[PDB]
Amino acid sequence: PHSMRYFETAVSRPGLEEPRYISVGYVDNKEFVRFDSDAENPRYEPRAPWMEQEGPEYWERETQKAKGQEQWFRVSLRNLLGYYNQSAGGSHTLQQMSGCDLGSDWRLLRGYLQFAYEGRDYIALNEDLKTWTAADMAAQITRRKWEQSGAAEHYKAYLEGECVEWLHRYLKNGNATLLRTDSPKAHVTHHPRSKGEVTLRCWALGFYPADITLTWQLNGEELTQDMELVETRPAGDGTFQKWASVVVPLGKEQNYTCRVYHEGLPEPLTLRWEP
């Protein structure tokens, strides 16, 4: 399985004609291109090494598309001000996510088109790529307008066509980096907690991709409802970090084992506190 997504944000700037618009492309959850209207000379830039394989014609065409989107978001932002009886003079945000997932059979598994206003669900294209799910009353206005205009067909065509074509290309071009792993480096630390009780923390560092599972066991059972699991966070060098901790009786630390599961590990790691 594999995916391409563009994540777009327009933020209105009070008194100003143009919003700030940012578009970020992802393949398999790795940022690979970015456009930002706030630059001196706004242009799409590569964000993954393997996008060096595209020539100047690619960057020109995609740059022109971004400026088109910026205008589409400008007009939409104004329309939304009216739907919600909002005064101008404040900032508002409009976001879009779109793209496609490929299955293991390498065909289109699903296409996506979703919009959010003020960080809340607004309208989405249904999986059928024909009907819309409008989140509130204002969005029903848009749903009816897009049904009237037959907007969905145009989106369907991109998602089943150009989205799939380009994701295949990016996967081929980026194969050697996108298909790689960096298995976690793991260790257990030991910490004071409270009277007669200590914390064991099982660390996983420098891993890629970000998907991972950490578990703790006592007497052959997972501590499902009894561990603190930190949110996965970037190391800042392209790899990720996570940890899982448990509070345990002082003197019983050796009864606990941490397991680490990751694509880069043929067999899961089994770890313990080692004083």
Partner: peptide, 10 residues
């Protein structure tokens, strides 16, 4: 290569 939205705005 990203989607150009339908000429129809929100």
């Amino acid at each position: 290569s990203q989607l150009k939205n339908n000429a129809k705005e929100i």
